[PDB]
Short mmCIF file of C-alpha atoms in Angstrom, two decimals:
data_model
loop_
_atom_site.label_atom_id
_atom_site.label_comp_id
_atom_site.label_asym_id
_atom_site.label_seq_id
_atom_site.Cartn_x
_atom_site.Cartn_y
_atom_site.Cartn_z
CA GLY A 1 0.00 -0.02 0.00
CA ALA A 2 0.95 3.66 0.46
CA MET A 3 4.48 4.61 1.73
CA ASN A 4 4.00 6.81 4.92
CA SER A 5 5.73 7.86 8.24
CA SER A 6 4.72 4.29 9.55
CA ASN A 7 6.86 2.24 7.05
CA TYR A 8 9.65 4.81 6.41
CA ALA A 9 12.59 2.39 7.37
CA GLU A 10 11.48 0.16 4.46
CA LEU A 11 13.27 2.72 2.08
CA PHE A 12 16.64 1.58 3.50
CA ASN A 13 16.24 -2.26 3.48
CA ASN A 14 17.98 -4.51 0.88
CA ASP A 15 14.94 -4.68 -1.55
CA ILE A 16 15.79 -2.50 -4.58
CA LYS A 17 13.35 0.34 -4.91
CA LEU A 18 13.13 3.56 -6.87
CA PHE A 19 11.21 6.85 -6.22
CA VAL A 20 9.83 8.46 -9.42
CA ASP A 21 9.05 12.20 -9.39
CA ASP A 22 7.44 13.59 -12.57
CA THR A 23 7.06 17.20 -11.27
CA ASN A 24 9.84 18.56 -13.58
CA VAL A 25 8.93 16.54 -16.76
CA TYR A 26 6.65 19.12 -18.41
CA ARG A 27 7.98 22.69 -17.68
CA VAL A 28 6.66 25.84 -19.31
CA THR A 29 6.93 29.66 -19.15
CA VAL A 30 3.50 31.39 -19.55
CA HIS A 31 3.69 34.59 -21.71
CA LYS A 32 1.57 37.20 -23.67
CA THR A 33 1.16 36.91 -27.47
CA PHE A 34 1.31 39.89 -29.78
CA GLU A 35 -2.59 39.87 -29.87
CA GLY A 36 -2.61 39.90 -26.04
CA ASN A 37 -3.56 36.14 -25.70
CA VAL A 38 -1.62 33.79 -23.34
CA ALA A 39 0.65 31.07 -24.67
CA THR A 40 3.18 28.57 -23.15
CA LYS A 41 6.78 27.91 -24.22
CA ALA A 42 8.09 24.49 -23.07
CA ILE A 43 11.59 24.23 -21.57
CA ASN A 44 13.70 21.07 -21.12
CA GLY A 45 12.47 18.88 -18.18
CA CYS A 46 13.58 15.76 -16.43
CA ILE A 47 12.37 12.63 -14.69
CA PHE A 48 13.87 12.21 -11.17
CA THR A 49 14.33 8.51 -10.53
CA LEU A 50 16.11 7.81 -7.34
CA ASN A 51 17.34 4.80 -5.32
CA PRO A 52 17.04 6.13 -1.73
CA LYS A 53 19.27 3.39 -0.37
CA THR A 54 22.30 3.90 -2.72
CA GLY A 55 21.69 7.54 -3.87
CA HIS A 56 21.89 6.43 -7.55
CA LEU A 57 19.86 9.04 -9.55
CA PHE A 58 18.69 8.20 -13.10
CA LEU A 59 18.01 11.72 -14.44
CA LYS A 60 16.31 11.25 -17.84
CA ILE A 61 16.33 14.65 -19.52
CA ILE A 62 13.04 15.46 -21.43
CA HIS A 63 13.91 17.67 -24.46
CA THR A 64 11.23 20.12 -25.65
CA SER A 65 11.21 18.29 -28.98
CA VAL A 66 9.14 15.45 -27.28
CA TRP A 67 6.15 17.89 -27.02
CA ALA A 68 6.26 19.03 -30.75
CA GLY A 69 2.78 18.62 -32.25
CA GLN A 70 1.33 16.86 -29.25
CA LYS A 71 -1.97 17.77 -27.45
CA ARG A 72 -2.89 17.54 -23.78
CA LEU A 73 0.76 17.76 -22.73
CA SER A 74 0.21 17.61 -18.91
CA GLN A 75 -1.60 14.23 -19.62
CA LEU A 76 1.10 13.09 -22.09
CA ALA A 77 3.86 13.98 -19.59
CA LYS A 78 2.63 11.27 -17.13
CA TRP A 79 2.60 8.56 -19.93
CA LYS A 80 5.99 9.72 -21.28
CA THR A 81 7.38 9.45 -17.66
CA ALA A 82 5.90 5.89 -17.34
CA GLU A 83 7.25 4.99 -20.86
CA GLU A 84 10.86 6.20 -19.86
CA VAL A 85 10.72 4.46 -16.36
CA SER A 86 9.63 1.19 -18.00
CA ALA A 87 12.47 1.61 -20.58
CA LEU A 88 15.01 2.22 -17.73
CA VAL A 89 13.82 -0.96 -15.94
CA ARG A 90 14.08 -3.04 -19.13
CA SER A 91 17.65 -1.64 -19.67
CA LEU A 92 18.77 -2.85 -16.21
CA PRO A 93 20.06 -6.33 -15.58
CA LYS A 94 17.50 -8.54 -13.85
CA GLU A 95 19.39 -8.38 -10.41
CA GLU A 96 19.37 -4.52 -10.66
CA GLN A 97 15.65 -4.22 -11.44
CA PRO A 98 13.52 -2.67 -8.62
CA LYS A 99 11.13 -4.76 -6.62
CA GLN A 100 9.01 -1.62 -6.03
CA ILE A 101 8.55 1.80 -7.72
CA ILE A 102 7.22 4.54 -5.40
CA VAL A 103 5.55 7.42 -7.36
CA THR A 104 5.55 10.84 -5.61
CA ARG A 105 2.19 11.86 -7.32
CA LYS A 106 -0.86 9.52 -7.37
CA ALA A 107 -1.60 10.57 -10.96
CA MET A 108 1.48 8.44 -12.09
CA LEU A 109 -0.06 5.20 -10.72
CA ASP A 110 -2.25 4.18 -13.70
CA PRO A 111 0.34 5.27 -16.41
CA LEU A 112 3.16 3.40 -14.65
CA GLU A 113 1.08 0.34 -13.95
CA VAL A 114 0.04 -0.04 -17.68
CA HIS A 115 3.64 0.54 -18.90
CA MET A 116 4.85 -2.07 -16.44
CA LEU A 117 2.29 -4.83 -17.29
CA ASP A 118 5.36 -7.00 -18.40
CA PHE A 119 6.62 -6.80 -14.81
CA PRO A 120 3.77 -8.16 -12.57
CA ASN A 121 6.08 -8.74 -9.61
CA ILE A 122 7.29 -5.01 -9.49
CA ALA A 123 4.95 -3.21 -6.99
CA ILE A 124 3.76 0.25 -8.04
CA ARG A 125 3.08 2.23 -4.85
CA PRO A 126 1.98 5.83 -3.98
CA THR A 127 3.22 7.67 -0.92
CA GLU A 128 1.54 9.81 1.81
CA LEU A 129 4.96 11.60 2.15
CA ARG A 130 5.12 15.19 0.74
CA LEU A 131 8.66 14.75 -0.77
CA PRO A 132 10.49 17.86 -1.99
CA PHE A 133 11.99 16.31 -5.19
CA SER A 134 10.42 19.18 -7.29
CA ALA A 135 13.38 21.19 -5.99
CA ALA A 136 15.95 18.96 -7.83
CA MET A 137 16.15 21.74 -10.43
CA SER A 138 17.61 24.03 -7.62
CA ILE A 139 20.76 21.83 -7.59
CA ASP A 140 22.90 23.86 -9.99
CA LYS A 141 24.65 20.88 -11.69
CA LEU A 142 21.24 19.06 -12.37
CA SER A 143 19.63 22.32 -13.68
CA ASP A 144 22.73 22.98 -15.88
CA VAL A 145 22.69 19.45 -17.65
CA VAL A 146 18.84 19.69 -18.24
CA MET A 147 18.96 23.23 -19.79
CA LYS A 148 22.03 22.50 -21.97
CA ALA A 149 20.57 19.26 -23.45
CA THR A 150 20.00 19.38 -27.24
CA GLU A 151 18.37 15.88 -27.43
CA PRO A 152 16.98 13.23 -25.10
CA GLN A 153 19.75 12.17 -22.72
CA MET A 154 20.04 9.98 -19.49
CA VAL A 155 22.59 11.24 -17.00
CA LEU A 156 23.62 9.23 -13.86
CA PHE A 157 24.49 10.88 -10.62
CA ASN A 158 24.90 9.91 -6.92
CA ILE A 159 22.69 12.40 -5.12
CA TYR A 160 24.51 11.67 -1.78
CA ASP A 161 28.01 12.38 -3.19
CA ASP A 162 30.41 10.37 -0.91
CA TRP A 163 28.08 10.79 2.32
CA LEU A 164 27.51 7.00 2.61
CA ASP A 165 31.26 6.55 3.47
CA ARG A 166 30.43 8.27 6.81
CA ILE A 167 26.59 8.03 7.40
CA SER A 168 23.83 5.53 6.79
CA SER A 169 21.29 5.68 3.98
CA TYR A 170 18.52 6.81 6.53
CA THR A 171 20.71 9.74 7.63
CA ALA A 172 21.69 10.52 3.98
CA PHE A 173 18.04 10.60 2.86
CA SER A 174 17.08 12.84 5.84
CA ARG A 175 19.92 15.25 4.86
CA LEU A 176 18.82 15.22 1.16
CA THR A 177 15.06 15.83 2.10
CA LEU A 178 16.13 18.67 4.44
CA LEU A 179 18.30 20.34 1.78
CA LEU A 180 15.57 20.03 -0.88
CA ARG A 181 12.82 21.19 1.46
CA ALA A 182 14.95 24.37 2.24
CA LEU A 183 15.65 24.89 -1.45
CA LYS A 184 11.88 24.53 -2.19
CA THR A 185 10.83 26.95 0.64
CA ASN A 186 13.34 29.73 0.00
CA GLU A 187 15.86 28.89 -2.72
CA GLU A 188 17.91 32.12 -2.50
CA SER A 189 18.37 31.71 1.35
CA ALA A 190 19.22 27.95 1.03
CA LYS A 191 21.87 28.64 -1.65
CA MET A 192 23.39 31.46 0.50
CA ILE A 193 23.65 28.99 3.43
CA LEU A 194 25.35 26.36 1.23
CA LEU A 195 27.95 28.75 -0.48
CA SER A 196 28.44 31.46 2.32
CA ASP A 197 32.00 30.19 3.32
CA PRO A 198 34.22 30.60 0.17
CA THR A 199 36.80 27.98 1.53
CA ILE A 200 34.22 24.97 1.23
CA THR A 201 33.97 23.99 -2.49
CA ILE A 202 31.98 21.43 -4.51
CA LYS A 203 34.19 18.66 -6.00
CA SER A 204 33.95 18.38 -9.82
CA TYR A 205 32.42 14.91 -9.31
CA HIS A 206 30.02 16.12 -6.56
CA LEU A 207 26.71 18.03 -6.37
CA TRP A 208 26.99 19.43 -2.82
CA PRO A 209 29.85 21.14 -0.91
CA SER A 210 32.61 19.17 0.89
CA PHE A 211 31.41 19.84 4.52
CA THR A 212 33.12 18.11 7.47
CA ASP A 213 30.87 16.18 9.87
CA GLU A 214 30.75 19.38 12.16
CA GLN A 215 30.04 21.77 9.20
CA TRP A 216 27.05 19.42 8.10
CA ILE A 217 25.55 19.89 11.64
CA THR A 218 25.84 23.68 11.38
CA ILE A 219 24.44 23.57 7.77
CA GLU A 220 21.57 21.22 8.65
CA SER A 221 20.69 23.61 11.70
CA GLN A 222 20.71 26.63 9.26
CA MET A 223 18.31 24.73 6.92
CA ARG A 224 15.91 23.80 9.79
CA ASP A 225 15.87 27.49 10.96
CA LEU A 226 15.18 28.65 7.26
CA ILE A 227 12.24 26.22 7.01
CA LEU A 228 10.58 27.16 10.36
CA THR A 229 10.99 31.00 9.70
CA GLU A 230 9.30 30.71 6.30
CA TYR A 231 6.53 28.53 7.89
CA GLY A 232 5.69 31.30 10.46
CA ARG A 233 5.53 33.81 7.59
CA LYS A 234 3.41 31.51 5.40
CA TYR A 235 0.81 30.98 8.20
CA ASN A 236 1.39 34.06 10.46
CA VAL A 237 2.02 31.68 13.50
CA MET B 1 -47.99 -20.99 -24.50
CA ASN B 2 -45.92 -23.40 -22.36
CA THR B 3 -46.27 -24.54 -18.78
CA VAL B 4 -43.88 -25.33 -15.89
CA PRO B 5 -45.84 -27.48 -13.44
CA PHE B 6 -44.95 -27.83 -9.76
CA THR B 7 -45.27 -31.19 -7.93
CA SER B 8 -46.22 -29.23 -4.76
CA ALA B 9 -45.19 -26.25 -2.58
CA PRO B 10 -44.18 -27.74 0.81
CA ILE B 11 -42.44 -24.53 2.13
CA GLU B 12 -43.56 -20.95 2.09
CA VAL B 13 -41.78 -19.20 -0.75
CA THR B 14 -41.84 -16.09 -2.97
CA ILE B 15 -41.84 -17.36 -6.57
CA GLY B 16 -40.51 -15.13 -9.38
CA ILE B 17 -41.21 -15.73 -13.10
CA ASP B 18 -39.30 -13.11 -15.06
CA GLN B 19 -40.21 -9.68 -13.70
CA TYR B 20 -43.35 -11.02 -11.92
CA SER B 21 -43.63 -12.59 -8.34
CA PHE B 22 -46.20 -14.38 -6.23
CA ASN B 23 -46.16 -15.42 -2.49
CA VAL B 24 -47.06 -19.13 -1.96
CA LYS B 25 -48.01 -20.43 1.57
CA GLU B 26 -46.58 -23.64 3.17
CA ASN B 27 -48.54 -26.62 1.52
CA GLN B 28 -50.74 -24.17 -0.54
CA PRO B 29 -52.23 -26.15 -3.47
CA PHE B 30 -50.04 -24.49 -6.14
CA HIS B 31 -49.16 -26.53 -9.18
CA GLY B 32 -47.26 -24.18 -11.44
CA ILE B 33 -47.13 -21.43 -14.10
CA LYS B 34 -48.99 -21.59 -17.41
CA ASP B 35 -49.23 -19.36 -20.57
CA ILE B 36 -45.42 -18.75 -20.61
CA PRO B 37 -44.61 -16.89 -23.81
CA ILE B 38 -42.69 -18.93 -26.36
CA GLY B 39 -39.76 -17.22 -28.04
CA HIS B 40 -37.84 -15.94 -25.05
CA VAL B 41 -35.58 -17.34 -22.36
CA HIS B 42 -37.32 -17.26 -18.93
CA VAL B 43 -36.18 -17.37 -15.30
CA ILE B 44 -38.17 -19.00 -12.44
CA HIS B 45 -36.75 -17.85 -9.03
CA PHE B 46 -37.23 -18.43 -5.41
CA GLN B 47 -36.83 -16.76 -2.06
CA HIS B 48 -37.87 -18.81 1.01
CA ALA B 49 -39.93 -17.03 3.65
CA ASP B 50 -37.77 -18.36 6.48
CA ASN B 51 -34.38 -17.65 4.87
CA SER B 52 -34.50 -14.41 2.78
CA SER B 53 -30.79 -15.26 2.09
CA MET B 54 -29.97 -17.13 -1.18
CA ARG B 55 -32.29 -15.98 -3.90
CA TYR B 56 -31.87 -18.84 -6.45
CA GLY B 57 -33.46 -19.87 -9.74
CA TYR B 58 -33.33 -21.49 -13.14
CA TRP B 59 -32.97 -20.06 -16.68
CA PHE B 60 -34.86 -22.21 -19.22
CA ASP B 61 -36.47 -22.06 -22.71
CA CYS B 62 -39.70 -24.27 -22.99
CA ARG B 63 -38.73 -24.91 -26.72
CA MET B 64 -35.82 -27.17 -25.43
CA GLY B 65 -37.87 -29.61 -23.27
CA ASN B 66 -40.66 -30.12 -20.72
CA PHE B 67 -39.46 -28.75 -17.36
CA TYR B 68 -41.11 -28.93 -13.90
CA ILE B 69 -40.34 -27.81 -10.36
CA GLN B 70 -40.20 -30.29 -7.37
CA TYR B 71 -39.14 -29.44 -3.81
CA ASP B 72 -36.18 -31.62 -2.46
CA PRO B 73 -36.52 -31.85 1.41
CA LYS B 74 -32.94 -33.07 1.66
CA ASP B 75 -31.23 -30.24 -0.23
CA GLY B 76 -33.95 -27.83 0.97
CA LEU B 77 -34.71 -26.21 -2.42
CA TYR B 78 -37.10 -26.13 -5.27
CA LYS B 79 -35.33 -27.93 -8.13
CA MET B 80 -36.02 -27.78 -11.90
CA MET B 81 -36.09 -31.12 -13.63
CA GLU B 82 -36.86 -32.32 -17.20
CA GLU B 83 -39.73 -34.80 -17.87
CA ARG B 84 -38.59 -36.93 -20.99
CA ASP B 85 -41.99 -38.69 -21.19
CA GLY B 86 -44.15 -36.16 -23.26
CA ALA B 87 -47.49 -37.97 -22.63
CA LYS B 88 -46.99 -38.15 -18.81
CA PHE B 89 -46.04 -34.37 -18.86
CA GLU B 90 -49.02 -33.36 -21.06
CA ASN B 91 -51.33 -35.42 -18.79
CA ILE B 92 -49.84 -33.75 -15.58
CA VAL B 93 -50.32 -30.19 -17.07
CA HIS B 94 -53.84 -30.90 -18.45
CA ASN B 95 -55.01 -32.22 -15.00
CA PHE B 96 -53.51 -29.20 -13.13
CA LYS B 97 -55.03 -26.79 -15.65
CA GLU B 98 -58.51 -28.49 -15.28
CA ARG B 99 -58.22 -28.02 -11.44
CA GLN B 100 -57.08 -24.36 -12.06
CA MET B 101 -54.11 -24.87 -9.64
CA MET B 102 -51.80 -22.84 -11.89
CA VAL B 103 -50.99 -19.07 -12.09
CA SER B 104 -51.01 -17.50 -15.55
CA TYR B 105 -47.91 -15.70 -16.74
CA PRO B 106 -49.42 -12.17 -16.25
CA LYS B 107 -48.24 -10.47 -19.46
CA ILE B 108 -50.07 -7.25 -20.58
CA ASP B 109 -50.43 -7.26 -24.44
CA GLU B 110 -48.95 -3.73 -24.85
CA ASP B 111 -45.93 -4.69 -22.72
CA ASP B 112 -42.55 -5.57 -24.47
CA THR B 113 -40.57 -5.32 -21.07
CA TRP B 114 -39.38 -8.98 -21.05
CA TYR B 115 -38.45 -9.00 -24.84
CA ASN B 116 -36.55 -5.75 -24.28
CA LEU B 117 -34.62 -7.15 -21.32
CA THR B 118 -33.81 -10.55 -23.16
CA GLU B 119 -33.60 -9.40 -26.85
CA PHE B 120 -29.98 -10.84 -27.22
CA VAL B 121 -30.10 -13.54 -24.47
CA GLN B 122 -29.89 -17.10 -25.88
CA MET B 123 -30.08 -20.34 -23.89
CA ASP B 124 -27.10 -21.71 -25.70
CA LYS B 125 -25.01 -18.79 -24.43
CA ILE B 126 -26.35 -19.07 -20.88
CA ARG B 127 -25.23 -22.75 -20.83
CA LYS B 128 -21.66 -21.65 -21.67
CA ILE B 129 -21.62 -19.04 -18.80
CA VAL B 130 -23.29 -21.55 -16.38
CA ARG B 131 -21.56 -25.01 -17.02
CA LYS B 132 -23.95 -27.99 -16.11
CA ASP B 133 -24.11 -29.79 -19.54
CA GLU B 134 -26.36 -32.70 -18.32
CA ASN B 135 -29.29 -30.19 -17.84
CA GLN B 136 -30.98 -27.97 -20.56
CA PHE B 137 -31.70 -25.29 -17.89
CA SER B 138 -29.30 -23.31 -15.73
CA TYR B 139 -29.18 -22.70 -11.95
CA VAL B 140 -27.97 -19.29 -10.67
CA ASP B 141 -27.99 -17.98 -7.07
CA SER B 142 -27.08 -14.93 -4.93
CA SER B 143 -23.66 -16.39 -3.87
CA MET B 144 -22.15 -17.84 -7.14
CA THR B 145 -18.77 -16.17 -7.90
CA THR B 146 -17.43 -15.34 -11.36
CA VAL B 147 -14.24 -16.71 -12.91
CA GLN B 148 -12.86 -13.13 -12.66
CA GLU B 149 -13.76 -12.92 -8.83
CA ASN B 150 -12.16 -16.42 -8.29
CA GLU B 151 -8.80 -15.43 -10.00
CA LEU B 152 -8.45 -12.56 -7.51
CA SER B 153 -13.01 -21.19 -5.33
CA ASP B 154 -15.15 -24.21 -6.74
CA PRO B 155 -14.71 -24.02 -10.60
CA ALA B 156 -17.94 -26.11 -11.33
CA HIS B 157 -20.24 -23.52 -9.51
CA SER B 158 -18.70 -20.39 -11.20
CA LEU B 159 -20.27 -17.81 -13.60
CA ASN B 160 -17.89 -18.01 -16.64
CA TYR B 161 -18.55 -14.45 -17.83
CA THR B 162 -15.92 -13.12 -20.31
CA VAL B 163 -13.05 -11.62 -18.22
CA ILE B 164 -12.71 -7.77 -18.94
CA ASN B 165 -9.78 -6.01 -17.29
CA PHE B 166 -8.69 -2.54 -18.41
CA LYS B 167 -5.11 -3.04 -17.04
CA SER B 168 -4.22 -6.34 -18.70
CA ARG B 169 -1.97 -7.23 -21.64
CA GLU B 170 -5.24 -8.35 -23.31
CA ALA B 171 -6.53 -4.73 -23.10
CA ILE B 172 -3.24 -2.93 -24.04
CA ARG B 173 -1.11 -3.40 -27.17
CA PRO B 174 2.65 -3.05 -26.39
CA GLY B 175 3.56 0.40 -27.72
CA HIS B 176 0.01 1.77 -27.57
CA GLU B 177 -0.17 2.01 -23.70
CA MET B 178 -1.64 5.54 -23.44
CA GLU B 179 -3.74 5.23 -26.61
CA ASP B 180 -5.38 1.90 -25.59
CA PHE B 181 -5.88 2.85 -21.96
CA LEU B 182 -7.61 6.24 -22.76
CA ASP B 183 -9.47 4.94 -25.82
CA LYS B 184 -10.62 1.30 -25.42
CA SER B 185 -11.77 0.92 -29.08
CA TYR B 186 -9.10 -1.78 -29.93
CA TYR B 187 -10.05 -3.76 -26.89
CA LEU B 188 -13.86 -3.47 -27.68
CA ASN B 189 -13.70 -3.96 -31.47
CA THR B 190 -10.63 -6.27 -32.19
CA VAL B 191 -10.16 -8.26 -28.96
CA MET B 192 -13.76 -8.51 -27.67
CA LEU B 193 -16.19 -8.05 -30.65
CA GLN B 194 -14.12 -9.60 -33.56
CA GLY B 195 -12.03 -11.98 -31.31
CA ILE B 196 -14.18 -13.50 -28.52
CA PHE B 197 -17.85 -12.60 -28.87
CA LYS B 198 -17.79 -12.73 -32.75
CA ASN B 199 -20.64 -10.08 -32.95
CA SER B 200 -22.44 -7.30 -31.03
CA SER B 201 -25.43 -9.65 -30.45
CA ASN B 202 -23.39 -12.08 -28.32
CA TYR B 203 -21.81 -9.12 -26.37
CA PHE B 204 -25.33 -7.61 -25.66
CA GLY B 205 -26.62 -11.11 -24.69
CA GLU B 206 -23.91 -11.47 -22.03
CA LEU B 207 -24.46 -7.83 -20.78
CA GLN B 208 -28.27 -8.45 -20.57
CA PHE B 209 -27.67 -11.81 -18.80
CA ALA B 210 -25.27 -10.26 -16.32
CA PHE B 211 -27.82 -7.45 -15.50
CA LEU B 212 -30.73 -9.93 -15.00
CA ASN B 213 -28.57 -12.02 -12.52
CA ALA B 214 -27.62 -8.87 -10.67
CA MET B 215 -31.30 -7.80 -10.41
CA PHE B 216 -33.07 -11.13 -9.74
CA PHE B 217 -30.38 -12.75 -7.44
CA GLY B 218 -28.45 -9.74 -6.08
CA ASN B 219 -25.42 -11.52 -7.63
CA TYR B 220 -22.47 -9.03 -7.02
CA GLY B 221 -20.15 -10.52 -9.66
CA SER B 222 -22.87 -10.22 -12.28
CA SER B 223 -23.34 -6.52 -11.37
CA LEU B 224 -19.57 -6.08 -11.80
CA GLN B 225 -19.69 -7.72 -15.32
CA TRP B 226 -22.77 -5.58 -16.35
CA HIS B 227 -20.90 -2.37 -15.38
CA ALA B 228 -17.57 -3.54 -17.01
CA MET B 229 -19.43 -4.30 -20.37
CA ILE B 230 -21.12 -0.79 -20.30
CA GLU B 231 -17.83 0.95 -19.41
CA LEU B 232 -15.93 -0.86 -22.25
CA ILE B 233 -18.37 0.58 -24.88
CA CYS B 234 -18.70 4.04 -23.31
CA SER B 235 -14.81 4.36 -22.99
CA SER B 236 -14.33 3.57 -26.77
CA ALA B 237 -14.16 6.59 -29.11
CA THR B 238 -14.98 4.33 -32.15
CA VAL B 239 -18.24 2.22 -31.78
CA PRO B 240 -20.55 1.26 -34.60
CA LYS B 241 -23.67 3.59 -34.69
CA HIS B 242 -26.09 0.64 -34.55
CA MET B 243 -24.33 -0.54 -31.32
CA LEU B 244 -24.69 2.80 -29.51
CA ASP B 245 -28.29 3.07 -30.60
CA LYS B 246 -28.96 -0.47 -29.35
CA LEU B 247 -27.02 0.05 -26.08
CA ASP B 248 -29.25 3.09 -25.25
CA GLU B 249 -32.38 0.98 -25.68
CA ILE B 250 -30.93 -1.92 -23.61
CA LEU B 251 -29.88 0.27 -20.69
CA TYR B 252 -33.16 2.31 -20.76
CA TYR B 253 -35.22 -0.86 -20.19
CA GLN B 254 -32.74 -2.14 -17.49
CA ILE B 255 -32.94 1.20 -15.62
CA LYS B 256 -36.76 1.32 -16.15
CA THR B 257 -37.23 -2.21 -14.60
CA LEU B 258 -34.71 -1.92 -11.64
CA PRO B 259 -36.59 -1.72 -8.30
CA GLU B 260 -36.32 1.90 -7.12
CA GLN B 261 -35.22 0.72 -3.70
CA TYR B 262 -32.06 -1.19 -5.04
CA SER B 263 -30.46 1.66 -7.08
CA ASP B 264 -28.06 2.16 -4.02
CA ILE B 265 -26.51 -1.36 -4.21
CA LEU B 266 -27.11 -2.28 -8.00
CA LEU B 267 -25.75 0.95 -9.61
CA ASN B 268 -22.07 1.92 -9.55
CA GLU B 269 -21.86 5.81 -9.16
CA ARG B 270 -18.38 6.03 -10.89
CA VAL B 271 -19.30 3.98 -13.98
CA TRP B 272 -22.67 5.83 -14.58
CA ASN B 273 -21.19 9.35 -13.99
CA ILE B 274 -18.22 8.56 -16.23
CA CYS B 275 -20.50 6.92 -18.93
CA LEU B 276 -23.18 9.65 -19.05
CA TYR B 277 -21.08 12.77 -18.47
CA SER B 278 -17.28 12.18 -19.20
CA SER B 279 -16.95 9.29 -21.64
CA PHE B 280 -16.65 9.46 -25.53
CA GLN B 281 -20.30 8.30 -25.59
CA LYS B 282 -21.59 10.94 -23.02
CA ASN B 283 -23.95 12.33 -25.72
CA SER B 284 -24.88 8.89 -27.42
CA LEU B 285 -27.22 7.56 -24.70
CA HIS B 286 -30.09 10.04 -24.75
CA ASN B 287 -32.88 7.72 -23.55
CA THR B 288 -30.70 6.18 -20.75
CA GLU B 289 -29.45 9.63 -19.59
CA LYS B 290 -33.12 10.92 -19.48
CA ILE B 291 -34.46 8.03 -17.39
CA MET B 292 -31.43 7.99 -15.09
CA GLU B 293 -31.74 11.79 -14.43
CA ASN B 294 -35.55 11.48 -13.75
CA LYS B 295 -35.39 8.15 -11.66
CA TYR B 296 -31.93 8.31 -9.88
CA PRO B 297 -30.68 11.98 -9.79
CA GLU B 298 -29.08 11.37 -6.32
CA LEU B 299 -26.61 8.77 -7.66
CA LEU B 300 -25.56 11.31 -10.31
#
């Protein structure tokens, strides 16, 4: 059934599973036409497919050419997501195929179930968790490869950098969800917190800065403060 | 005009014949039903006064043999049987008729209700859904599960309705996932009509039989099948015009006949709202939409 606060540890067991987030697949800017009507212009998007145990991220870049001459694009975006996730599963060796796919949005269930009919033993699950994976495009290196793409492309990352050398996958996921929740709530403030000390850099092969264990505690505290402030503002509480 | 004689009525029972019903008292001198119209299937159905659980009954066609009802005190039900001796049977019926111990099938001349509910229903198709090849008539009851319900446990007592599943490889061509899921025309027209049913008449016959089992026995699996066969047509963008016109007539008479008090359990809100207001065929079922809006506006 649904993945929730109750069954959260299941994310870090030894059963291969992927989160799929389709938020950033179909992206547009809304603008005025010469005649004063409104139109959209698509920009490149991405499917965010993440192994929460290992940090392996399958970033399938969705090039605007996909949408050319298609109707009902927000509907099509879900089916295109399910087509590409199905294609990714088929591309993996059997021993690397997921046992479960957790979709962040309930509207992905039917599209993914129908594309995965050939895999009756892979469970397609919704979640009650309100995960901040929409903010993936606030990670500068992910945003940069998506915008630069001139054709459909799959790019592989580890979203945890080298963190699993020092921390468990539970702690790594918690740090990732905190960073993304801060980036989602106040991007400018979160990015200021992450880059404020010029001496801490991002390795060429990494997404996030090279914080010591003590610096990560300071950073995580700054992200928590950012999130609660913004919350008091949002709700006047 | 054919007759189904009864040996006796030893237990108090409500007896149904098609859309009609009669209360019979324990040991009331009741000996059957005469003047049954030839040319249609019929159903004779029972609900005991002491156990209003298990409605049960028999589908039959008097053209196929001489049938009678006899109570079995061991199995505790009214059973249909075939009399193979024509002269014994004619003599039984003639005697009971002379003593006027038979009710008359109470058909109004103007009234095409039964024809309209059974237009495509054939005994030979019923006998493939309800498998008991040694009898020419078919037993159905409230509790019998469908092959589809069983997949998801006694195979010999199942309703072998055609399995319809919108999220199945049968329903979805590899490479046409979105197209086939959002527009079920290939599943309706190639897989079901051309492939399995062979023609719209056999499809409608099964749809009408499922409805009648839902209505007369409260058979839940039958109600599921009736709605699935409606949804498969309404969810297809491409349906022959004769089929849509015929479906509107079929459903109109089904909704007209349904007891007003059973709309809550026998009608699926999602399917009817989707079929009448959202589907490709939202504007193709004028008669059905008008009777549903006047008879069951709460459901909608």
